[PDB]
Amino acid sequence: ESGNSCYIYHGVSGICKASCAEDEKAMAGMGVCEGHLCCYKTPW
């Protein structure tokens, strides 16, 4: 498994995608996405 998941900070984890939704924020350069973006939302 392992799955797709890109941890950023406490309470903030994203999903590895080629491009992020309209209501999502992107984080480039994360190894576990393997070239993809990390697409997350902050709970604040």
**Binding site residues, other proteins, CB under 8 A:** 1-5, 7-13, 26-32, 42-44
Whole-number minimum distance, CB 30 to other proteins, in Å?
Answer: 5
Q: What is the DSSP letter of 10?
A: T
Q: Which of these, 36, 43, 38, lies nearest to 27 by C-alpha position?
A: 38
Q: Which is nearer to other proteins, 2 or 19 (CB)?
A: 2
Q: Which is nearer to other proteins, 22 or 43 (CB)?
A: 43
Contact 14, 8 (CB under 8 A): yes
Q: 31: Cβ–Cβ under 8 A, 6 or more apart, which residues? A: none
Whole-number minimum distance, CB 2 to other proteins, in Å?
Answer: 4
